[PDB]
Design a protein around this ligand. Structure first.
Ligand code: NA
Length: 971
């Protein structure tokens, strides 16, 4: 504390703290009214001493301190976010008091004064509590702060420490059992499903087995993310001693004060005076503390030496006693505990391991009640009523096992069984339902959403823990419903398909060049495989082996059965939940990605993905199995304009940077864009590139139509109707871009090996290249293709700091055609100089590779002569002239393959037919085909009707999921 008023203009943000570790400690204090004020050193919050206040009923002491209390506006201006001046302190009762403390604020207050405003603190409790109120908002209708003991209590005794005037976040003074504020987080009210399971030996055993299975996971290796594991006992003893915790003879502890990472905000640490900051730095951060608690519990469970095991128990129990005495108990807000999980997640888990110890020490009820109370922050999930928001992917990551741990700690058997039964139902619903609109959760095409779109960086950690939850509960009366198992399998098989083993650049969300990897989800495949109704699920088992690099020989001891590791999946898979598709051939995967009204192009934050504008610009990133960095996808020097496959305007980075300083998730201008599939082997992307009417830095007249047809070892790319405001100046389509290294050092051009750096040349129709990753590019329609091996300067995506690197790249320059520019080229995924010569020759023979049957604003039609498949991107409903397709009445992607005796036709719209609020509903598409056909089976849901000379097909497109039918000719 200082001589200046609280909230003083030299530093309004500098807190005034009465911590008594300075001279004239009680100078500003006058006991007066029937009170005696002493300092004690057996107990304290900040420093080593606290104020001991002995009193008789209705008596008072006074803090003499001028306050120039700022308005919420003044406070908020001073800090930079919505704020309020707050008065706070800590108090300790050694026994409960049947009355209220009255704290009053006024001018020259003595006991006879009435004067102004104040508040009430209920004293019916024991141990430390914190009190914190907004001076502007929390008082019942200044240089005097008067603390008045209860009028209706004969006598008593209170300890008080760390009296503080500070500027605080206006959201975070919470009500509790001692003080009422304007803010309240309501307590959990558990849902309960009927009928109830009975307490029986079987049901009780199953509960205890679930607890044991959880213990197993947390002690038996498997590295948890965001757990600072420490197994060396000596280190644990060392950190524990440094806590300086001692039991006090008559109840309570003394030791270092515990504070959460969010609680510290009330002090305004960075603005504390030096005397205060030094005393504040001897606080212990709760997160580190509960991590220590967990690490000790794990060590205790594993400890072979009975003496060492008993030491570990004692350390844990004492940590527990200190924690509760510090005021982390039921009904104690501690002013706030928001983001509670970051400070306590491993406390919940530690109680599983220490369940028996807590019981014998008679601490289980107190710990349960405390954890339950602080969990009220998570009431929307912890209540366990299934709602539109229950499929929250972050919950599965950060809270789901903690929620289960809490339930298992409930003391009553019948209630514990009710809770875990309800939890089983909650998880089954969460993993089964299709959330409406853009709400989190799994989707019917296998995508999995957070931040309102498919997002691997969030889904991957959720798949790991949701699979683990199902495995924890397996083969008991609490097992997750098969519907939830099925939906999660669809999503995890899908993730296997769209990762290699990292997801592509187009799926990297706001972390380009730091994609999530299926390697982090590996154990989830084992857990889900082993929790099948008929375990093991061979598919998921085979995937686990592949991802974890385990052999068939190793499979028997893991799964109880010999299983061949999955080979890399082959063919084409449409995922319109992200307006993408994946083509796979041999060890390569191609991520084809568009965007539209329902799929944001990119997620860009204040400090993430700043240059991500073209992340979804009809990209087609090719990735061979293995590290993408090893393949030359290097952030340093990367030209963010030149994302592989995209048509873009090449811009200076200052212009390419998102025009919003904080968040932009730019959605497209129509519902239609994405992909479709045929026979699980062939695919087509259709991408209608349209920009907003008036978004700064976005050219409103930038347009393109871009389609890709993928089959076997090749892809055919075509583009039409390319335009901009400036006659296609700087308009480019990128064939490829990758870093140059000793292993990636060659480019083939037209049978010639190029290694020089720098190197430039220009190519045209009939020319070919092979990049260092073995992809062949044959230029089939373009006037001007630039090829460059050059030093490039760029900036990294978080803080825009300069980077550099050497790159090989090639792009089509569309500026040769001022209006409705166009391109065609073809990629071969297994290219060699030899095979490319063969392809170029085939091209020169009246184009034996493919034929473009239509290339306009309404339809793109590509016949692939290598695979004998035709793809039809109806950007608009149209009647057409064609051998197979006559008319389609909605924007759609249609595909055909005439095999020996059949015609297979697939259709979809990649338009999900939804909004951010509304559930997707099915789109009915009528596809008229030429000629008379009948159905070459009966297992297929597409409807058909001969009508005159032609056949009417009726497709139902739900969530952009393709359907197909095998047809045979009618005589
Ligand atoms: Na103190």
């Amino acid at each position: 504390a200082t001589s200046n008023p609280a909230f003083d203009p030299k530093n309004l943000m500098q807190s005034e703290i009465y911590h008594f570790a300075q001279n004239n400690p009680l100078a500003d204090f006058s006991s007066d009214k029937n009170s005696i004020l002493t300092l004690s050193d057996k107990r304290s919050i900040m420093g080593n001493q606290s104020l001991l206040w002995k009193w008789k009923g209705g008596s008072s002491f006074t803090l003499h301190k001028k306050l120039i209390v700022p308005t919420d506006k003044e406070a908020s201006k001073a800090w930079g976010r919505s704020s309020t001046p707050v008065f706070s302190f800590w108090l300790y009762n050694e026994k409960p008091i049947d009355g209220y403390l009255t704290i009053d604020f006024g001018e020259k207050l003595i006991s006879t004064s009435e004067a102004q405003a104040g508040f009430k603190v209920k004293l019916d409790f024991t141990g430390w509590r914190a009190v914190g109120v907004s001076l502007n908002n929390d008082l019942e209708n200044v240089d005097s702060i008067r603390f008045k003991a209860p009028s209706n209590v004969s006598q008593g005794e209170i300890y008080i420490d760390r009296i503080m005037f500070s500027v605080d976040d206006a959201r975070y003074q919470w009500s509790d059992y001692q003080v009422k504020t304007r803010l309240s987080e309501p307590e959990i009210q558990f849902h309960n499903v009927k009928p109830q399971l009975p307490v029986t030996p079987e049901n009780l055993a199953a509960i205890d087995l679930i607890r044991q299975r959880l213990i197993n996971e947390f002690v038996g290796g498997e590295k948890e993310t965001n757990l600072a594991l420490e197994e060396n006992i000596s280190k644990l003893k060392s950190d524990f001693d440094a806590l300086n915790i001692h039991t006090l003879a008559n109840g309570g502890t003394q030791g270092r004060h515990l504070i959460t990472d969010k609680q510290i905000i009330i002090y305004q640490p960075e603005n504390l005076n030096s005397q205060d900051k030094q005393l504040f730095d001897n606080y212990v951060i709760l997160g580190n503390y509960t991590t220590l608690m967990f690490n000790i519990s794990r060590a205790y469970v594993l400890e072979k030496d009975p003496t060492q095991k008993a030491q570990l128990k004692q350390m844990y129990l004492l940590m527990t006693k200190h924690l509760l005495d510090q005021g982390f108990v039921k009904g104690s807000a501690l002013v706030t505990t928001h983001h509670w999980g970051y400070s306590s997640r491993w406390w919940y888990i530690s109680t599983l391991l220490m369940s028996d110890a807590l019981k014998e020490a008679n601490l289980q009820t107190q710990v349960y009640d405390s954890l339950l109370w602080y969990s009220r922050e998570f009431k929307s999930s912890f209540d366990m009523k299934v709602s539109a928001d229950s499929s929250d992917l972050d919950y599965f990551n950060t809270l789901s096992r903690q929620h289960l741990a809490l339930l298992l700690l409930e003391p009553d058997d019948q209630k514990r069984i009710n809770l875990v039964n309800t939890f089983s139902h909650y998880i089954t619903g969460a993993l089964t339902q299709v959330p409406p609109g853009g709400k989190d959760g799994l989707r019917p095409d296998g995508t999995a959403w957070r931040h309102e779109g498919n997002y691997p960086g969030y889904s991957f950690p959720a798949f790991k823990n949701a699979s683990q939850l199902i495995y924890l509960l397996r083969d008991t009366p609490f097992s997750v419903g098969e519907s939830g198992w099925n939906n999660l399998k669809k999503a995890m098989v899908s993730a296997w398909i769209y990762s290699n083993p990292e997801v592509g650049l187009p799926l990297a969300g706001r972390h380009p060049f730091n994609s999530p990897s299926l390697k982090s989800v590996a154990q989830g495949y084992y857990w889900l495989a082993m929790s099948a109704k008929s375990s093991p699920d061979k598919t998921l088992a085979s995937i686990y082996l592949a991802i974890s690099d385990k052999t068939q020989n190793e499979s028997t001891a893991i799964f109880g059965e010999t299983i061949t590791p999955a080979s890399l999946p082959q063919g084409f898979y449409a995922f319109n939940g992200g307006a993408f598709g994946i083509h796979r051939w041999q060890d390569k995967m191609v991520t084809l990605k568009a965007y539209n009204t329902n799929v944001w192009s990119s997620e860009i934050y204040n400090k993430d993905n700043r240059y991500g504008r073209y992340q979804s610009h009809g990209v087609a990133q090719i990735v061979s199995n293995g590290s993408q960095l090893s393949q030359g996808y290097q952030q340093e020097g990367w030209d963010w304009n030149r994302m592989e496959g995209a048509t873009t305007i090449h811009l200076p980075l200052k212009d390419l940077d998102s025009p919003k300083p904080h968040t932009l998730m730019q959605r497209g201008e129509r519902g239609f864009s994405g992909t479709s599939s045929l026979e699980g082997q062939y695919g087509m992307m259709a991408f209608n590139l349209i920009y907003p009417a008036n978004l700064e830095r976005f050219d409103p007249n930038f347009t393109a139509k871009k389609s890709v047809l993928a089959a076997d070892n090749h892809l055919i790319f075509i583009g039409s109707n390319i335009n901009s405001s400036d006659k296609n100046k700087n308009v480019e389509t990128t064939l490829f871009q990758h870093a140059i290294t000793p292993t990636l050092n060659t480019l083939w051009i037209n049978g010639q090996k190029i290694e020089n750096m720098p190197y430039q040349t220009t190519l045209q129709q009939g020319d070919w290249l092979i990049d260092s990753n073995g992809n062949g590019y044959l230029i089939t329609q373009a006037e001007k293709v630039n090829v460059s091996r050059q030093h490039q300067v760029s900036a990294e995506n978080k803080n825009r700091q300069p980077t550099e690197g050497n790159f090989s790249s090639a792009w089509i320059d569309h500026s040769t055609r001022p209006k409705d520019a166009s391109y065609e080229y073809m990629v071969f995924l297994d290219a060699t100089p030899e095979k490319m010569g063969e392809m170029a020759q085939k091209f020169r023979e009246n184009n034996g590779l493919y034929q473009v049957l239509r290339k306009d604003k309404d339809v793109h039609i590509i016949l692939d002569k290598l695979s004998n498949v035709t793809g039809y991107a109806f950007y608009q409903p149209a009647s057409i002239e064609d051998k197979w397709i006559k008319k389609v009445n909605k924007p759609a992607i249609v595909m055909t393959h005439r095999q020996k005796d059949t015609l297979i036709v697939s259709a979809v719209t990649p338009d999900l037919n939804m909004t951010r609020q509304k559930a997707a509903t099915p789109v009915t598409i009528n596809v008229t085909i030429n000629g008379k056909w009948q159905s070459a089976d009966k297992n297929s849901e597409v409807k058909y009707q001969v009508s005159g000379d032609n056949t009417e097909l009726t497709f139902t497109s739900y969530f952009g999921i393709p359907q197909e039918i095998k047809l045979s000719p009618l005589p």
